[PDB]
Structure formats: C-alpha cells, structure tokens
Amino acid sequence: VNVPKTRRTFCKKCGKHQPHKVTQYKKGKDSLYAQGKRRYDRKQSGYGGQTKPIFRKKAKTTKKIVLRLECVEPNCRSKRMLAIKRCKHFELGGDKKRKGQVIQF
Amino acid sequence: AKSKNHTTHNQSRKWHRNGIKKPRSQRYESLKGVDPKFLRNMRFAKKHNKKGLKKMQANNA
Amino acid sequence: TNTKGKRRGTRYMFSRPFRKHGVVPLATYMRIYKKGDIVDIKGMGTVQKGMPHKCYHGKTGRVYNVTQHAVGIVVNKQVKGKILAKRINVRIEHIKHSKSRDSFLKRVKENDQKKKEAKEKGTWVQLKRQPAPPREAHFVRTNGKEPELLEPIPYEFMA
RNA sequence: UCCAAACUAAUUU
RNA sequence: GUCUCUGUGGCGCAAUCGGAGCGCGUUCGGCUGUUACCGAAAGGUUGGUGGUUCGAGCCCACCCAGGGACGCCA
RNA sequence: GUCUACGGCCAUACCACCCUGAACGCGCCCGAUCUCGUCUGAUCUCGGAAGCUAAGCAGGGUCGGGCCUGGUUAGUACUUGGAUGGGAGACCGCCUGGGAAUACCGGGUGCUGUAGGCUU
RNA sequence: CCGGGGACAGUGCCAGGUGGGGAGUUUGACUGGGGCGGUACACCUGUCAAACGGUAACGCAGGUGUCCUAAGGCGAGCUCAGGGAGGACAGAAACCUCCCGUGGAGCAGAAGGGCAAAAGCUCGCUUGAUCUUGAUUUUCAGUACGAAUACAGACCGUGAAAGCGGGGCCUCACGAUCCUUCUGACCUUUUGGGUUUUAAGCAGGAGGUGUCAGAAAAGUUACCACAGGGAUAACUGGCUUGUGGCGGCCAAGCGUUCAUAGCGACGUCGCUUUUUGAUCCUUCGAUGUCGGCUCUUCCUAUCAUUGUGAAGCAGAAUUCACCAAGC
RNA sequence: ACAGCCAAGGGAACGGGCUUGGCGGAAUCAGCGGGGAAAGAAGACCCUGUUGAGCUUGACUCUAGUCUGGCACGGUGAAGAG
RNA sequence: AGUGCUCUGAAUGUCAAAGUGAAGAAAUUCAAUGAAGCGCGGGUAAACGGCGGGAGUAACUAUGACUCUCUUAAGGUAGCC
RNA sequence: UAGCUGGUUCCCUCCGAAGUUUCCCUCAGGAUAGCUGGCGCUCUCGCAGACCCGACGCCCGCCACGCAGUUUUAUCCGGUAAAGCGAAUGAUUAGAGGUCUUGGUCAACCUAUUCUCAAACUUUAAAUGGGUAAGAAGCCCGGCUCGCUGGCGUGGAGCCGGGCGUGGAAUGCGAGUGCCUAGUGGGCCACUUUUGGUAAGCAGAACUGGCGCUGCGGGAUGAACCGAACGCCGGGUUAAGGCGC
RNA sequence: CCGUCUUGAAACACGGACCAAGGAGUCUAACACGUGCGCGAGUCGGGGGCUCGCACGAAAGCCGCCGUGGCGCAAUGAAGG
RNA sequence: CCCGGAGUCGGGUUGCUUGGGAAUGCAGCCCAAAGCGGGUGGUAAACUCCAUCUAAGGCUAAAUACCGGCACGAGACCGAUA
Ligand SMILES: [K+]
Ligand SMILES: [Mg+2]
Ligand SMILES: [Mg+2]
Ligand SMILES: [Mg+2]
Ligand SMILES: [Mg+2]
Ligand SMILES: [Mg+2]
Ligand SMILES: [Mg+2]
Ligand SMILES: [Mg+2]
Ligand SMILES: [Mg+2]
Ligand SMILES: [Mg+2]
Ligand SMILES: [Mg+2]
Ligand SMILES: [Mg+2]
Ligand SMILES: [Mg+2]
Ligand SMILES: [Mg+2]
Ligand SMILES: [Mg+2]
Ligand SMILES: [Mg+2]
Ligand SMILES: [Mg+2]
Ligand SMILES: [Mg+2]
Ligand SMILES: [Mg+2]
Ligand SMILES: [Mg+2]
Ligand SMILES: [Mg+2]
Ligand SMILES: [Mg+2]
Ligand SMILES: [Mg+2]
Ligand SMILES: [Mg+2]
Ligand SMILES: [Mg+2]
Ligand SMILES: [Mg+2]
Ligand SMILES: [Mg+2]
Ligand SMILES: [Mg+2]
Ligand SMILES: [Mg+2]
Ligand SMILES: [Mg+2]
Ligand SMILES: [Mg+2]
Ligand SMILES: [Mg+2]
Ligand SMILES: [Mg+2]
Ligand SMILES: [Mg+2]
Ligand SMILES: [Mg+2]
Ligand SMILES: [Mg+2]
Ligand SMILES: [Mg+2]
Ligand SMILES: [Mg+2]
Ligand SMILES: [Mg+2]
Ligand SMILES: [Mg+2]
Ligand SMILES: [Mg+2]
Ligand SMILES: [Mg+2]
Ligand SMILES: [Mg+2]
Ligand SMILES: [Mg+2]
Ligand SMILES: [Mg+2]
Ligand SMILES: [Mg+2]
Ligand SMILES: [Mg+2]
Ligand SMILES: [Mg+2]
Ligand SMILES: [Mg+2]
Ligand SMILES: [Mg+2]
Ligand SMILES: [Mg+2]
Ligand SMILES: [Mg+2]
Ligand SMILES: [Zn+2]
C-alpha cells in the first residue's frame, strides 16, 4: 500500500482535526530489566535447561502495519498509534498514481 | 474407527416433552436498546411531571 | 459441513422479482412506523445496508424502536428447543405493515360502532364469528328439464 | 621448430 | 490416484530476467589441381487450447506426448 | 374536453409506423453583452420573442409486436394422509383431501392526487 | 640430597566452544483397517437440501491467508458490451461521425445477488480508513474472536442544499492468557518521610499461536513389552456380483448357394458363487494359515461309456443336442 | 455352565438345546480321530492408548569429559615498548 | 564437489566472561579491544561414500568403429554375471 | 499411574432416559446445553351447603384467567415437484424461406418453424409447510409533562382522570416459577424424500414411528413386520390372523 | 443358561465343575444446596482457664462482652482512596 | 576516666534453596572493609532527614515432641480365614 506522510486527523490532546506526520512504527529493543525478563532470567539460571516454550512455527507471512501519528501543532506534539490492515509491500509517501498517461514500454 | 457424523433424529421429541414455550411477554417491557436521544427526553418528561399536579387536580375535580 | 456465511443460500430469497429491478418505489420510504405495530420482514437486494439475516425473512414482529432510517423489531425465533425473542435493527426498505392485524382493527372499530346502538332496538347482534355452519335444507328445481346422464368414456391411447 | 588431411571401379601409348 | 517437470530452427539445447539464441548442420561465394579454414545469407503455428494482462515463449485452467517421485502389515 | 408544474402506483403506461392537434400552455426557435461553460453558445448557462406545429409532447389508428387479464389446457401433471393394494421389479391403480404450467382461443391498452390554466 | 624442569605446568572458581560418550522426553489428528496420498483441521460462494430456517459423507464445482491514497469519502457530468452505416493514406484491428443498443459491459479477486441522469467511466475537493461509551445481529451454550447492523456524543470532509460518509456495492480476507513493545493521563503506587532516576500499574495499538478456542518436539524395533480392542485389518463364513465363469433372446453377416448344420456382429436379458474386488455382520481371555499325501461322499454346467435326435451325417473320423452323474 | 443323535429354517449371517420334520431302548468292552468353531495361553500379526522399553540420529532440552580465555596461588632480576 | 578428519592463522570477518575507556547523581548505558570455535585456505578415498543422458552415421538390410551434443566431483576402468 | 478389562452383595412402591448441539492434541474421554428425578414454592378451580336439596338476583343475556406437536378465519413468506425452451442463459436435431459476402452451386449468415434437455438454468408454479393475528396489556373520552421534534394549538413519547363486559372463532386443558441433580454424549431399523456406489444385511442425510428399555396375540421359526402395549383374577367381546389333521 | 460388554447373546463371544467362609462407594478436609434444631443483627468457645479426691468422668457444668478471633452487619477502585 | 569479637561484614558472580518477588537463606570462588561506624527499615539507584538494634564469642529451666523401652490403666474395637 501507499499511505501519504501527512494527514489531517483527530488529535485527542486538543480535540480537533490537526495535521499529523505519518511515520511507521518500529518495535523497540527489550529492556533486560522488565519484570518478565527478570523472571525469565531467574528461571533459566542453573540446571534445568529451557523452561519457557520456544515458538518456531510462523504461520503468518505479513504483519499488521502500525503508523505512529504525531501532530504538528508545536506546543503539544502528542503521538498516536494507528493500525491498518495487513500488507506485504508497504511504502510511505510514494508516488501518486494517475490515470492519464502511458505505461510502460 | 468411523462413526455417525450428525443427526437431528429424536431431537424433535426431546424438546416437545417440556414443550416449546413461547417467550412470556408482560406489560411494561424493558426500554433497553431504544434511541439514547429519545430516552433522555422521556426521563425529562417525567422529571418535570409533578410540575402541574395542582393544575391537573383542579381540572379532574 | 456447510459454511456459516451470512448470505449462504439466499440466491433467490434476496434477489429481485422479474422486471422489478432497479429504483425502489419511493412510497416504501414514507410509511409511518409507530412503536408497537406489526411489521412483515422481507428484505430486498437492492439495498445492502441494514438487511436482516436470512432466518428472519418472512417472519413478523412488532416495532419497539424507531431511528432515522431503521426500526427495532421484536421477532420470535425458534432455535432448537425454545422460542426466544430477538431484537433486530432493520432499515425500513426491508419491511412493510402487516395486514394480518388490520382486519382485526377493522372489526374492533366495527364492534364499538354497534354496542352503544344495540340496546334501543332490543338487538343482541352477533359479534363472535362462527366457523362456517353446515348447509341448511333447501329445494332444487329441475325447471322441467331432466338431469343429464353421465357415463365414463372408453379408454383410448395417445400419449 | 604456428597449423598443412585425403586423392577414378569407369581400364587401351 | 496425487504432485512436480520437459515441449522452442534439421539436431542437442538457451533466455524463465511479462517489454526468439548458442553450437553444429544446411544453402551460397571464396581459398584449393579437387574434396579444414575464411565470408555471408536463410530458417521457428516458440505442443495445443482458453483464460489474465499496458504486454506473454515466460503467469494462470485444461488436453496431449513424455519422464520422474511418493506404497506394504499380512 | 384538455394541458402545465410536482407526484403516487410503475408497460393496460413500452416499441414501430400512420393520422389529427381550436385556445392556452409546453416546445422547437432567435441571439451571446452580462453570469457560466465548452475543441465547438451543439450541449450547459444567460438575454430574448421574428417564425413554426416539422419534431418532441398529446389524442386516435394497426385482423400490429409485447404487456395486463380471462378461457382452454385439466380435475391433467404433481401431492398430504391410508391399506397384509397390484406387480419379480421398475413402477401403477384405488381411498382421503388439495390442485398447476405452456402451446391454443378471447378481452383490454393507463388509472389517479395536489396546485394553476384553457375551453363561451 | 643429586639432577631436571619452574612462575609455566598444574589445581581451584567463573566464561565460551565442542560433546548421541551419557541422561530425560517427544515423535499431531481425521481416515470405508492402518501407512502412503489428500485436508473434508480456520474461513467463503453455488449445489446437494426434500419451496421458512437447520441438515451428513475422503459428496460435487470453485475460492481464500491478499489487494487498495484510492480501487476510501462526498459532489457533478457522463454511458456501457456489441452491431450497423459511412470517412485521405487505413487493411481483420489506428482515429472521426451518426444510428441501434435493458445492461448482453463494468464494478480488485471465487461464485452468487445487486447496480444505468447508477454501485459503472471521467473530472473537482478531500481523509468518516479518525475520537468515544453502550445496545443489537451473525456463529451460538444463545460464551469469545472475527465480521456486521442501527444509534448516540465529538471533531471533520463534501455539496447550493436535502444530505451523505466512521473504509472497500453485499456475502470471505483472520488470533486468547502470559510475556514484550509503543502511545496516552502537569494520573496512581515504588513499603519510616521527602526529592530524582528506575520499576510496577490503569487505558488503547502491535509482535502469534494456519493442529487457526491457541503444547516447545525426529526415527526405528524381526530382540520387543503392557493395557485393551472383533468399535479395526489379515484366513474361514455371510450379503452383493462390477470382475471372473456359464447360458438365453434379436438377426447384420460367415458358411462356394443358403441368417439360424455349425456359427453370430450392433444390441439386450439372466443364472452361478470355484475368482477377485466391494463391505466390515461374527471371532483378537486364539476357530492352527498354502500345497502335496491319504480317504470318503456329493454336484452337473457330460470328457468317455448305455439309449437317442441333428448335420455342410456316403463309409471312417468328427461336431451339435437330449435322458443320464451308474461307472 | 448344563450337557451330549440328525436335516433344514430362522438367528450375532456354520445350533447339543429353539421352530418344523426325521426319530428316540438299559449297562458296557476294545478301537478310532468326523465333531465338541476340543484342550494348553487375558493374540505375537493388526490397530488403539496422549502406557512403555532396547537402539539410532541432522529431533528437542541437557550432560561427564575435553578445548580455550579470565582471576587466584605466583615470586626475583634485567632489557626493550607504552 | 558432499559429509568428515586434518594442516595453516596472514591484514583475517564473526566472537564470551574479565579487563580498558567515556557518558551519568548512580544503578546503568555506549564504544574500543578482540581466545578457542565457526567462516575463509590447502591436503586426504586400503576415510564415509560416489562413479550420466540424448541424436546421427558403413554403397542390400541390420548393426555402429567414427561424428555431434546437453551434462557432472568423476560418468563404472580390469574383471565377472 | 491407568481416558483400559473384569467384578460391585436385601425386598417392594412411584417416576423414567440418552447415543444429539458447541468446545477440547478431541475421535475407547471430558466439559457444555438438551433429555431425567427430587425438593419445593406461587397461584387457580374450588371443596360445597347435617339427612334434605339446581339455584335465589339485575321480561333479556352471561358464567374466570391463561395455555395448545390441533383446526378455522384473516394475512404474509418460499422457488421444491411439475411445467417451460415458437421466454433469457446454457445443451441440441432436422428441413424450409431469404440473400447481403474476405466461403468455395455449396456452406456461412438472417427470418419463421421443428426434435430433445438442465443438481450447480428459468418467465411461470403447486401439495405439504413456516410466521403473525383473532382485545380490558383493549376501546372511547378529557387534561397534563417534555431539555425530543417544530410554520402551527405541530409531531411523538410519557403521565393523570373518566367512561365502556355480548370476555369479541372452534375444540381440549389447571397453570406459573425456582433450586439441586444422576445417567447419557458407540445407537440401530422401517415407510416416504434422498446422496455416493454395479450393488450390498453397504456408506451418509431429512421426516415420523419403532427397537435399544418391552412383555403379549399373529408372521411355523425372528431385536425392528401387523395387531395391541402389561397390577392379581372371573365373565363377556374383539383386533391382526385364521378355521382338512 | 445365567452374569457381562454390546445396535444386537441361547450363541460357534467371554467368565462360571461343586460347597463353605471371607469379599468391593469408606473415612478426613473443603465447598455447594436442600432439610431439622437453637439463638437472632448478631452468632459461636472451637483454644485456654475454674470447679468433692480420676467408678461412669478422657464426661458434664461454668466463665465475659475470658468475645482475642472467625463469619455476618458495605460496597467499589489496579491503587491513592 | 574507661569502653568492645575481621579473610569478618559487605560487594560481585555461580549453584542449591525460599512466599521472598532487580536476588529469603546457605555455600563455593574472586574482591575485601569501616569507626558519630556497622546492620536492618520486603522494588534496583543516587541524595538527605528520622527510627531501630549492636553481627562476626559463650551458657540457660519451664511450657513442647515421643509407632522404640520399662510399667500400668482403659475401650460403642477384633473374636481363631478376624
Ligand atoms: K515385511
Ligand atoms: Mg552456569
Ligand atoms: Mg458419536
Ligand atoms: Mg527438438
Ligand atoms: Mg514387518
Ligand atoms: Mg443555442
Ligand atoms: Mg407538434
Ligand atoms: Mg403533426
Ligand atoms: Mg396485439
Ligand atoms: Mg537418547
Ligand atoms: Mg489415527
Ligand atoms: Mg424443506
Ligand atoms: Mg453521479
Ligand atoms: Mg456522528
Ligand atoms: Mg465505491
Ligand atoms: Mg530512605
Ligand atoms: Mg534386523
Ligand atoms: Mg465388526
Ligand atoms: Mg459379467
Ligand atoms: Mg450369405
Ligand atoms: Mg457400519
Ligand atoms: Mg483351540
Ligand atoms: Mg479345532
Ligand atoms: Mg444334464
Ligand atoms: Mg454348542
Ligand atoms: Mg475330534
Ligand atoms: Mg487381549
Ligand atoms: Mg495382549
Ligand atoms: Mg486420545
Ligand atoms: Mg520412552
Ligand atoms: Mg540438535
Ligand atoms: Mg562392465
Ligand atoms: Mg480412550
Ligand atoms: Mg468398551
Ligand atoms: Mg434451493
Ligand atoms: Mg423437474
Ligand atoms: Mg445399550
Ligand atoms: Mg400400518
Ligand atoms: Mg459386535
Ligand atoms: Mg446372555
Ligand atoms: Mg453362532
Ligand atoms: Mg473379553
Ligand atoms: Mg471355563
Ligand atoms: Mg459370605
Ligand atoms: Mg442450612
Ligand atoms: Mg522450590
Ligand atoms: Mg523501597
Ligand atoms: Mg545452646
Ligand atoms: Mg484357626
Ligand atoms: Mg482354624
Ligand atoms: Mg490369624
Ligand atoms: Mg469356628
Ligand atoms: Zn498536540
């Protein structure tokens, strides 16, 4: 799909439609001090081997695409997550298609 | 090995033993699911309904 | 095993009658649905929003809610062991007033018309309709003619 | 010191 | 039965990269006393039948002619 | 008797072809400064009022085609219930109740609401 | 003590590699037996399905794990597939023009339904594919997910306006707990008080479980064990008779002539249970399982023999039928 | 188990018993292997079980041993280099 | 070529703990430095193992010494059936 | 340890099943809802007038609600069976009439006919069936409330009084409601419809009844056919079936 | 010809030669509802203590707001509250 | 005037253990103390008030346990296959 990288949608911080900057969400890096990681590393210490299940199936071939939306009103610049449907090939701010011309030799 | 897959044999006489009873409607059914803008008028039409007992009781008498 | 799809088997049910395709006649939009009247639920195909599910096509329920474009109907549904009353929201293209009630409203307006005018003639008029009595005794004139003799025709074989 | 193979059965001095 | 796979110039066989070729052969000049080498030209329902498509030899559905592979407790 | 504007039911109203159309209207029609659109004042938009019922539209017509409605088809086909009915079967009779569709043969060809004209 | 090494080796503790030498465990399910093959394992259309709905088979014909800043949203203007008749080059196809055209086109895809001053095609402007809380529908236990429908409250787009719009004309296009991550509240805790990092929470997205209500999983056993199972295979029996075997009817033809002495195409009607398929009714706390040897009896669908009939029966030999299973 | 002569039928589709028929005469002796789907044994084949065990490996988790780095025991002189 | 085993360790890519450096109020975080192994490079089949298809061709025919070809790590040799 | 075999001890009385839905590494099991029993409870009709006795109020007329595997009367719903193809979509046989031409008199083409078809075609279209309705929760009068709606005393909903019993089809019947809860989740057969298969005492559905749980008479014999369902007896009479022995 | 599992047993399905005796839904805890009893906005000593010298008596009685405590009389929110 | 227990505390890391959760206890190994200090103050850290106790030495009755032993007493127990 091809979403444009600017968008007028609702900003909850101010309660209006405001211009946003559409940017694609990336999964952050894990903490090593979060509570499930501390439970996990305590449980793996010592003898016993692997204790939690390890998944290794991967039936999906795509992911849902999440857009982080940041409003450009300068004094409150809040961010909202927005999810769209599954897609293989995702571009952002791509070329707008147009119905007139000749394609392609 | 294999088995019977599906049947509704005997089912029609199972649920006629205790009858197929209609839903017993009553006077004053519930207002669950009516229009919300409609429903808050009707609460306001009853909140101010005492505003006029004295004109109403001096008109039945 | 069949699919559990929402329009499975509605090839003819939700289709249109022959040479009745196209624009909906506009007087199906200007009926008036009060709360508590009996509507017949049918379901067109020209309008896809707000159509009832196929288990309600041909049922009959009463109106409990009225919106801008739709209605709320209370319909009995016989699921396997018991009948339970379902509250469905249907856009008003798919319904119509039921004339099953209107013959009964024709005679309630006929009975009050004749109870305050019954007594002064000493009339005890019949109100309870009775289920089609046996035919009474009567005479049958021949008018001089005699009845035509009928006899079975011989068999012959064509097809 | 680059490669370089073959040659009517058709006869008469 | 099921699933893959091949089909293209006379022959073996490319490109699988939606936008017709190697080698060899065959003609045809040459060189030679005369039959490797040098030069040049020609040649293809690109299996078939419909699809899809801006566009098919390349992607789909089928048919054919060939192949291959998947089975064992009696 | 009939039209105009807005409709309701959406062919008994549609299609082809012929004939008639007083008065009103509706149209065709005449023009492009303005408004507004075009490759093009053809459409659309605007300004008109010399001409004309030619066409649209309306009314009529056609052993017309369709459509609507009756007859026949036919108590036929099929079908609910029933039998220690028949028949090797396939199927078929009867009892008890329901009851069609063509071809074929007739009839019909818009009704009507609200507002406003016209017709002596 | 004499030589020889010597701050190395070595030992102790931690870390990385290697490690079937050893340990533990697993090695889906459905299934006309199981395995192999398929997926009928989550979904969707048409049919089956017997004119409400519901309805099965490893029933039929197909589809699906996507695609889309427009192919979403409004508004306006347009009309399609095809055909005909014409027009320099121009033809079976280039573009131009008129006429016919009830959808025979198109609407992302499967099929079905829908659709014409449109749901189609083309332009203009846009982001209602956004923020919210409940109710309802569909599957259904009337639980969840998914999807969907009516509202209501905001903020918006478009249009002169009525309005219409919270994705795709409708029916498919997808995912719990735990954990992780991100966003949000000048929000709550962070343990005697306070400040600041960190952490934990509350609310909404995402990362995924296709065995699709969601374990983390390779074989082999003929050296094999146990609990059971005729719910289930292998031999026997039974039902059936496609297949195998044996007959009938009809009569194109063959038989130098001549349908039928003997035959018998194209058809079609049967019988039999020595075959094998098909099934899974009986037996798995056991019916000893191929053949030969030995021995008895039975069947007739007759190879010979007794008695006959027929011939393309001169004799001879042979062929076709009948009674017949005594031998 | 009780028992003990057959044919056919029906029947959990090969009956000693049941139905219909054939029939049925004490108590035994030596033999015999047609029956009692005779006896011996909770079928080994086959399947099922979320029961196993032996054995393999490119299964999944480990692991002795080894290989390697680090710290410690661990010191004394020189020279370079930083 | 595969799988092993083996030699080599060059500037080698990847690469743990400790150690070093910086940022910070600290927990922490980042960077540098890089052991074996893996990767890269040789050797090795009396190691495990492996060792092809398709066309055309002799003047009767039939065969095919010869020819062309796709192709792989080599295309099964001496033998024997 | 065993979701697997085997066994599980006295009598009478009453009531009396399920092999189906959905989910599960689920298919020899469980949870889930059905089906069962028990415990009740809330009401109705009412008990019936000591022996008596149809009655005792207001010329007529009337006799509670509710409920139902049922019909009636209204009224919707459906696309099966049949029919259709000189109706669309497909499949398809034959002649005839026209004559335009990128066919070579022949075809193609067109028009009017003609033969035969359809689970995944249909203009049409039953039988059987499915839904609702047939009153007091109504009807007719007045008024009041509203922040909803709005040209308007509008529209809509709500509220408060007052007035109307011929109880507004037939037939039958006492009804409502709660808690707790076992067993079952292998079914099989038959009529009619029906799918796979040459068929099958075969595999898979629908509808109802049956067997399983159930004896008895009849079919010689038999889970399931036909008749009819069961306390212990006498008399009488039948059903299906019979009546030579 | 009985028990048994089964759609279906007289079965060519299994177990049973015969007799006696033994032989299989128990007890604890925790819940749920139903029922009986006592007290009732409360209720309960269960632990401890006090009582002629312990046949029965290892019983029975008593305590006092020993009522500490449990449950009940107040919910909701993750939490501040 | 006089005043206190060091390879100990504490920190790191590994392993077992615990309701102990960024580590409850115990152990190995490395590091390794202080003196208005040290420990604890149930979320890792820095800062700062406050509370609390005085680790690394030692002794100690009663209330508590008791299927063995010696010696008794009793029982809604069993009655010789128990
Ligand atoms: K074998
Ligand atoms: Mg470790
Ligand atoms: Mg079952
Ligand atoms: Mg070739
Ligand atoms: Mg084997
Ligand atoms: Mg003009
Ligand atoms: Mg005119
Ligand atoms: Mg005219
Ligand atoms: Mg006509
Ligand atoms: Mg192992
Ligand atoms: Mg299986
Ligand atoms: Mg039906
Ligand atoms: Mg438009
Ligand atoms: Mg809104
Ligand atoms: Mg659209
Ligand atoms: Mg502090
Ligand atoms: Mg072996
Ligand atoms: Mg069986
Ligand atoms: Mg045969
Ligand atoms: Mg002849
Ligand atoms: Mg079966
Ligand atoms: Mg035996
Ligand atoms: Mg034997
Ligand atoms: Mg014979
Ligand atoms: Mg026997
Ligand atoms: Mg014997
Ligand atoms: Mg066994
Ligand atoms: Mg066994
Ligand atoms: Mg299982
Ligand atoms: Mg094992
Ligand atoms: Mg491994
Ligand atoms: Mg050889
Ligand atoms: Mg099991
Ligand atoms: Mg069993
Ligand atoms: Mg249908
Ligand atoms: Mg038909
Ligand atoms: Mg049973
Ligand atoms: Mg009968
Ligand atoms: Mg059985
Ligand atoms: Mg028995
Ligand atoms: Mg038997
Ligand atoms: Mg057994
Ligand atoms: Mg025995
Ligand atoms: Mg005993
Ligand atoms: Mg109680
Ligand atoms: Mg533990
Ligand atoms: Mg803290
Ligand atoms: Mg001590
Ligand atoms: Mg004794
Ligand atoms: Mg004794
Ligand atoms: Mg003893
Ligand atoms: Mg004794
Ligand atoms: Zn902002």
How many C-beta atoms surround the C-beta of residue C124 within 10 A? 8
Q: Which helix (H) or strand (E) holds A79?
A: strand A79-87
Task: List phi, psi (to 5°) of B12.
Answer: -70, -20
Q: Which of C64, C72, C76 lies closest to B23 in CB terms?
A: C76
Q: Which of A66, A67, A65, A70 is nearest to A19 (CA)?
A: A70
CB C34 within 8 A of CB C50: no
Which of C65, C130, C120 minimizes the C-alpha distance to C92? C65
Nearest to C85 among B11, B15, B23 (CB): B23
First to last CA, chain B: 85
How far is residue C43's CA from residue C24's CA, in Å, rounded to a whole number? 12
Distance of alpha carbon C147 from alpha carbon C144, whole angstroms: 10
Q: Give the residue from C72, A43, A102, C111 showing the smallest Cα distance to B30.
A: C72
Encoded tokens for B20? 């197929």
- Which DSSP letter does residue A101 get? S
Through-space separation of residue A29 CA and nucleotide I15 C1' in angstroms: 22
Q: Work out if A42's Cβ lies within 7 angstroms of strand G.
A: no
CA of B5 to the centre of ligand 8 (A): 78
Of residues B22, B23, B34, nearest to C65 (C-beta): B34
Q: Is residue A67 packed enough to be buried (19+ CB in 10 Å), middle (13-18) or exposed (0-12)?
A: buried
Length C25 CA → J109 C1' (Å): 44
Strand, coil or helix: B7: coil
Q: Rounded to an integer, what distance in angstroms lies between the CA atom of residue A80 and that of residue A20?
A: 10
DSSP string covering A9-68, please?
EEETTTTEEEEEEEEE-------SSSHHHHHHHHHHSSSS---S--------S-EEEEEE
Interface check for C65 against chain B (CB to CB < 8 A): the answer is yes
- Phi and psi at B40, nearest 5°, equal -80, -10
| C36 backbone φψ class: left, alpha, beta (φ>0; ψ -120 to 50) | left
Collapsing DSSP to helix, strand or coil, A7 comes out as: strand
> With contact defined as beta carbons under 8 Å apart, do A21 and A70 qualify?
yes
Which nucleotides along chain H are within 7 A of a protein C-beta? 60-63
**How buried is C62 (Cβ within 10 angstroms: 0-12 exposed, 13-18 middle, 19+ buried)?**
middle
Of A59, A60, A65, residue with least CA distance to A87: A65
Task: Report cis status (omega within 30 of 0) of the bond before A104.
Answer: yes
Output the CA angle A64-A68-A71, nearest 5 degrees.
Answer: 150
b vs e for A26-42, b when ≥16 Cβ sit within 10 Å of the residue's Cβ?
Answer: eeeeeeeeeeeeeeeee
- Strand ranges for chain C from DSSP E: 38-41, 60-66, 70-79, 82-91, 95-97
| Whole-number Å distance between alpha carbons of C7 and C10 | 6
**Experimentally, how was this structure solved?**
cryo-EM
Distance A33 CA to ligand 2 centre (A): 20
Resolution in Å, one decimal, please: 2.8
> What values do phi and psi take at C48, rounded to 5?
-100, -25
Which amino acid is it at B36? P
Residue C71's CB is within 10 A of a number of other CB atoms, namely 23
Q: For B14, name the nearest residue in chain C, comparing CA atoms only.
A: C81
**C-alpha pair distances (Å), C31 with each of A91, C95, C120:** 51, 10, 41
User: Helix (H, G, I), strand (E, B), or coil: what is residue B41?
Assistant: helix
- Note whether C80 contacts B11, CB cutoff 8 Å: yes
SS3 A95: coil
Question: Quick one: closest CA in B to C35, which residue?
Answer: B34
Q: Which helix (H) or strand (E) holds B40?
A: helix B36-47
Q: What are phi and psi of A96, to 5 degrees?
A: -80, 130
